[PDB]
Amino acid sequence: DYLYFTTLAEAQERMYDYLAQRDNVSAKELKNEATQKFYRDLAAKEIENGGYKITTTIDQKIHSAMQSAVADYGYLLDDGTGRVEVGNVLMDNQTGAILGFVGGRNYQENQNNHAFDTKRSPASTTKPLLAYGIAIDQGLMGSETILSNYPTNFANGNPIMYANSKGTGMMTLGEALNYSWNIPAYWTYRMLRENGVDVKGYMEKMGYEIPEYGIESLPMGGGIEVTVAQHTNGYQTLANNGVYHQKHVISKIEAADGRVVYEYQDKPVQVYSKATATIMQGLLREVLSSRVTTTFKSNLTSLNPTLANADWIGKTGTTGQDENMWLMLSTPRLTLGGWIGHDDNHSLSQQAGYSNNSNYMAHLVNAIQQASPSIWGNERFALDPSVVKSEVLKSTGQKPGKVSVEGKEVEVTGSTVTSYWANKSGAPATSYRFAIGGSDADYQNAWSSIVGSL
Ligand SMILES: *C(=O)[C@@H](NC(=O)[C@@H](C)NC(=O)CCCCCN=[N+]=[N-])[C@@H](C)O
Ligand SMILES: [Cl-]
Ligand SMILES: [Cl-]
Ligand SMILES: [Cl-]
Ligand SMILES: [Cl-]
Ligand SMILES: [Cl-]
Ligand SMILES: [Cl-]
Ligand SMILES: [Cl-]
Ligand SMILES: [Cl-]
Ligand SMILES: [Cl-]
Ligand SMILES: [Cl-]
Ligand SMILES: [Cl-]
Ligand SMILES: [Cl-]
Ligand SMILES: [Cl-]
Ligand SMILES: [Cl-]
Ligand SMILES: [Cl-]
Ligand SMILES: [Cl-]
Ligand SMILES: [Cl-]
Ligand SMILES: [Cl-]
Ligand SMILES: [Cl-]
Ligand SMILES: [Cl-]
Ligand SMILES: [Cl-]
Ligand SMILES: [Cl-]
Ligand SMILES: [Cl-]
Ligand SMILES: [Cl-]
Ligand SMILES: [Cl-]
């Protein structure tokens, strides 16, 4: 089934590297197609014939429970657009070990591996990693920073849409994330480009391959296609307080006599600061609890109220024609990635991600907990001590003070809130352009509203 072939494919690649090195084949010799074919064939026969011991990270009880869950509850994905396919990956946050996965509805009927093989746009699940996480890390925004959701157009002249909405006005990062508004993410990524932030540095540290970083829609998953396993590794990094561990299924390959062919070597990388990661955890907690883009917390509270009280964070995504839905879930111990869609890229129902995938993934997390009662953990995500806490205006997301509005000095006062920052100095004093993005017209409207309240 999926685990047999995924494991064999990875073991064959590791055996290929081992045999080439053993036989002293140069990097140049390895470029020769005939030599590669020979070593791929030799690697396959060595595994087939050779009595190697392959040690995996798979938790057999958990993986078996995940197979039973998709067998029993996969039908909950069927939304009237034909049989819906599915991929899930369960990853240990502290190691990057893959404990179990779902490759699809039924290997016997369709062998396509939707956990490791299928690549689709991650849509809005890109935003925490590529936009907000980097902006916070770079000290360009904090937890209560204000962003423009005023109407604006892409470079191609098309309005940036959110379902049928061309936008609203200013909003907090929390509102932007809970709803997954698109315009704020557009402005955030534009700010990173304008500031010459090495976004590629962050994304490549987590193993993402993105061909063009200048794509305006990158934060909405334009110009990016990922496997469930790779994308689960991105969320692993945020959950693990910003420290990436490379995903893996194989821990070791030994000969019969115990010679080591291959052994996974941990290379932990601090991709985001602990401050950044722990701020993002707090924001993604509210994404699920707000229940705006997913019913997951309602589904899970009914199935397993005790497990629903574990410290869940996560994020949804929907591609623009409903071809792909994503739900990424973490507790401090584990990350579970989930994709649904059709092999031929035809549309799902409008609610497929909001309701169906949320209900299926609530069943999947419950099945995992029933197989391994302690595996999700009862630990909480918590702000790192290095987090800077700033008292800022609710209105501007910046510290109270005076600003020139229509040429006149205005004392900007009002309700304050604690804003969490990952820099040294925290939030700046309020400036006229207090938000991420916005036109002059947007700022005229925003300030007219704010001045009205003083
Ligand atoms: C999040 O999931 C939001 N939707 C998206 O991210 C969709 C629009 N993303 C994609 O379909 C990927 C390609 C980029 C499209 C950019 N605009 N166009 N065309 C959801 C909350 O709206
Ligand atoms: Cl399997
Ligand atoms: Cl497979
Ligand atoms: Cl040999
Ligand atoms: Cl096991
Ligand atoms: Cl992969
Ligand atoms: Cl896609
Ligand atoms: Cl515009
Ligand atoms: Cl939407
Ligand atoms: Cl909200
Ligand atoms: Cl870049
Ligand atoms: Cl990738
Ligand atoms: Cl670039
Ligand atoms: Cl592996
Ligand atoms: Cl041997
Ligand atoms: Cl740090
Ligand atoms: Cl909740
Ligand atoms: Cl609900
Ligand atoms: Cl979404
Ligand atoms: Cl789509
Ligand atoms: Cl199909
Ligand atoms: Cl906290
Ligand atoms: Cl302060
Ligand atoms: Cl600073
Ligand atoms: Cl800006
Ligand atoms: Cl304007």
Residue nearest to atom 14 of ligand 1 (CA): 222
DSSP string, 81-97: SSPPEEEEEEEETTT-B
How far CA 279 is from CA of 10, 92, 274, in Å, comes to 36, 21, 8
Residues 6+ apart with CB under 8 A from 118: 85, 87, 112, 227, 228, 339, 343
Matching residue, tokens 């290095």:
386
- Please report the atom of ligand 1 found closest to the CA of residue 121: 12
User: Is residue 146 classed exposed, middle or buried when 0-12, 13-18 and 19+ CB atoms within 10 A define those classes?
Assistant: buried
CA distance 150 to 160: 10
Residue 409: its H or E element: strand 408-412
CA distance 420 to 367: 36
Q: 212, 217, 321, 354: which to mutate for ligand 1, most atoms within 8 A of CB?
A: 217
Contact 284, 177 (CB under 8 A): yes
Residues 6+ apart with CB under 8 A from 275: 136, 383, 384, 386, 387, 388, 420, 421, 422
Rg of the chain taking only CA atoms, in angstroms: 24
CATH number 3.40.50.12800 is the correct assignment for the domain at 388-453? yes
Q: In which residue ranges of the chain is CATH 3.40.710.10 found?
A: 65-250+265-371
CA distance 123 to 219: 8
H-type alpha helices, 292-439: 296-303, 305-308, 358-371
User: Which CATH code fits 65-250+265-371?
Assistant: 3.40.710.10
Matching residue, tokens 């299924």:
249
Q: In which residue ranges of the chain is CATH 3.40.50.12800 found?
A: 388-453
Contact 383, 391 (CB under 8 A): no
CA distance 197 to 189: 10
H-type alpha helices, 23-97: 33-50, 60-73
CA distance 439 to 150: 8
Q: With b meaning 16 or more CB within 10 Å and e meaning fewer, what string describes 311-334?
A: bbbbbbbbbeebbbbbbbbbbbbb
Contact 281, 381 (CB under 8 A): yes
Q: With b meaning 16 or more CB within 10 Å and e meaning fewer, what string describes 32-68?
A: eeebeeebeeebeebbeeeebebebbbbeebbebbbe
CA distance 203 to 244: 11
CB of 220 within 6 A of ligand 1: the answer is: yes
3-state class (DSSP) for residue 147: strand
CA distance 39 to 435: 57
Contact 109, 359 (CB under 8 A): no
The two tokens of residue 259 are: 């010679």
The two tokens of residue 396 are: 């501007």
Q: What's the CATH class of domain 2-50?
A: alpha beta
The binding site for Mg(2+) comprises 207, 209
Residue nearest to atom 13 of ligand 1 (CA): 222
CA distance 376 to 368: 9
Q: Work out the angle at residue 397's Cα, subtended by the Cα atoms of residues 426 and 418, and round it to the nearest 5 degrees.
A: 60
Q: With b meaning 16 or more CB within 10 Å and e meaning fewer, what string describes 198-207?
A: ebeebbeebb
- Please report the atom of ligand 1 found closest to the CA of residue 216: 16
Q: Work out the angle at residue 140's Cα, subtended by the Cα atoms of residues 425 and 148, and round it to the nearest 5 degrees.
A: 130
Q: How far is the CA of 232 from the centre of ligand 6 (A)?
A: 9
The two tokens of residue 156 are: 């191609």
Q: How was this structure determined?
A: X-ray
CA distance 120 to 337: 13
> Beta strand 313-318 with 416-421: parallel, antiparallel or unpaired?
unpaired
Residue 440: its H or E element: helix 440-453
Deposited resolution, Å: 1.6
CA distance 101 to 66: 7
CB of 162 within 6 A of ligand 1: the answer is: yes
Residue 252: its H or E element: strand 250-254
3-state class (DSSP) for residue 159: strand
H-type alpha helices, 126-225: 133-137, 173-179, 183-194, 199-205
The two tokens of residue 450 are: 């704010």
CA distance 417 to 415: 7
Task: Say which ligand is closest to the CA of 125.
Answer: 1
CB of 217 within 6 A of ligand 1: the answer is: yes
The helix, strand and coil proportions of the chain, stated in percent and rounded to the nearest 5, come to 40, 20, 40
Q: How far is the CA of 162 from the centre of ligand 9 (A)?
A: 5
CB of 318 within 6 A of ligand 1: the answer is: yes
Residues 6+ apart with CB under 8 A from 309: none
Length of the chain (residues): 454
Q: In which residue ranges of the chain is CATH 3.90.1310.40 found?
A: 2-50
Residues 6+ apart with CB under 8 A from 449: 169
CB of 135 within 6 A of ligand 1: the answer is: no
Residue nearest to atom 8 of ligand 1 (CA): 320
